[PDB]
Amino acid sequence: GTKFPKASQALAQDPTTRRIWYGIATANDFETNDGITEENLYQKIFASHFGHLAIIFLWTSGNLFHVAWQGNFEQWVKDPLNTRPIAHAISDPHFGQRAIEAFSQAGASSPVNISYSGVYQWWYTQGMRTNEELYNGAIFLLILSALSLFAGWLHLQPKFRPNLSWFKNAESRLNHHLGGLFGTSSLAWTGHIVHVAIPESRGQHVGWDNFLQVAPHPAGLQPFFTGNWGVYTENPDTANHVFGSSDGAGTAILTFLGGFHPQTQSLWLTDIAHHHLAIAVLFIVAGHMYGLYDTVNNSLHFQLGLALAALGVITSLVAQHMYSIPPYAYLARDFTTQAALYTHHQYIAGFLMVGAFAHGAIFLVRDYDAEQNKNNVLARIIDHKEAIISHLSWVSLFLGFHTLGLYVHNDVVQAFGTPEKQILIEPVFAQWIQSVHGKSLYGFEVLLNNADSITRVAPGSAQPIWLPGWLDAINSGNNSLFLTIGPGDFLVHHAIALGLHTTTLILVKGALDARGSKLMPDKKDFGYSFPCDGPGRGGTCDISAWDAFYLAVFWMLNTIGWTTFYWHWKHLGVWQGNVAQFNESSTYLMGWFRDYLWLNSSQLINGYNPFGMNNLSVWAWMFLFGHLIWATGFMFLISWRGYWQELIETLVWAHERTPLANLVRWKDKPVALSIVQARLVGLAHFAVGYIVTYAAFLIASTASKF
């Protein structure tokens, strides 16, 4: 009937409100469009990617532009320890006079937002010092987005439309991406660090206006070709050195000091330069090297699911390594953005990993051809699918019964006035690893704690020079490089393990039963997402593979929550130098309820009250805002379609029978949300609320006490 949605004529003939909703949902699902050939499909993907890239470019141009225009970067560079980074100005007409005086902070004369994205500490390290270098980044990214947008349009034109064979030319892509995209980019990034980052950290300004004149090393590029590479490991920076000046500055550009710079409490710039140069070489060599693998190549969902899994794993990696090994100057000192950066990337990682299994299940129903897939690894995992699921079921139950059991045991025993009766297991396997890495606290005394061990001496070539810098930081109680752990850390790690196993279980069972089960032998014929199969055969709600992902989104949030809850509380004591609170209260759950949630919410909950308002009124409003939209999701998840469809019918009747309103009419007949729709809408509210509530609390609780 109507033209919208263009992608699906069957939705376009639906006379109800369902059409718009489903037309929004089935829009970027290019595969299910009308008449879409394989060749046309791929070219659309490619072009859509250019559009996404441009948005990314515009986004970080908008962060540069707003910081240069409304931030305090120039003021921050002068004293990173005491200057609060400004995100952008505040222009909300609804503000009153006292509220403008509360958000006119960080020494500003306008209301502004204190930034917590860590962009100030990232841009500083790269060599930016003034606002005009920031603005030059924003304009350049504007062009690159316009270069991205034009290219997407360009590669859609007849003469420039890539062939199908080009997109599936796998071997050429690995070589060029590992070589070019990864290798030469990493090599280029080494170029930026030795020619700009390292000079600016030593008080010498190097910009586009002079970089072709000045040299990164006193007599560089004659030792490089003649093989005397060791000259670049000349006199490093002294422990007295103050970042951003020439006092104590050296001249080395490639080193292997290890550890962190004593003032900024972060990695040495010269150390970061060598890393990227080495990494570059590895990728360039590997980039000259180029059944199951054909079914990888014909399914876009298989590739995406593996690419989500690969991104999801390394997204978690970024979070784990940035808090313990700080790579940006003065990022360890601002505790709130370090809290924000870990939480942000861990939640993203949870979505990616869950998404990886989601697109894997889509592959099994729509792309897996079981006749062309026999006697390989894929068709063997489906062959003992019930074994895998049952074992995943056992480990979850095993982990869960006992970790919760110990917590409940400890809680009761602590409630009855007898804390000495708690069951506290020392994390000895972990504490062994810390002693294997050099932490001399537990005294296990083998590998890099034993001073005569082969791993510290290395009598083959006398290599081991990373050891002095590393050992100083891992033994000094001033950072997060292998934090001290105890009984509290043991229990939570098994809770996190419980979360990783149960979340994987839901995703694995959903994928392996996607094509069919006993309750629904022909499930694959109905696609990835369908309501159910009616009340027959006992009942079939939540039987589709999509519903399995849906249930798993609840478990990942819970899992990433327990991860972020743990990281925050532990670091909270560590940042206040009173580690005793976490160590003793985390072994029972009332400690997590009284000394973590209730205790740290004192100021946040007082962002505004009957006596006034402070610079936390936003976070306090957001905190309540999050609770309301979290709870609003429960409505769609608990109450189902039927109640609402019948209720809506009385509203249709009422509208048509009331004068002065009867006169006007809907173009789309009102109907209740769909069965699948409600799950999605409920989960979206739940998960937006889950994150928005924790973000408001995390930021405000840490910013209040530091």
Binding site: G1, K3, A89, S91, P93, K667
Partner: peptide
């Protein structure tokens, strides 16, 4: 100064335009 002009454009005026543009696009037909 330019904040005072732009944030009611993309806050009020520009969403009123694109909602007007999307609503006629939905309810058109052949």
């Amino acid at each position: 100064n330019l904040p005072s002009i732009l944030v009611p454009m993309v806050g009020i005026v520009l969403p009123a335009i694109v909602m007007a543009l999307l609503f006629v696009y939905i309810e058109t037909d052949e």
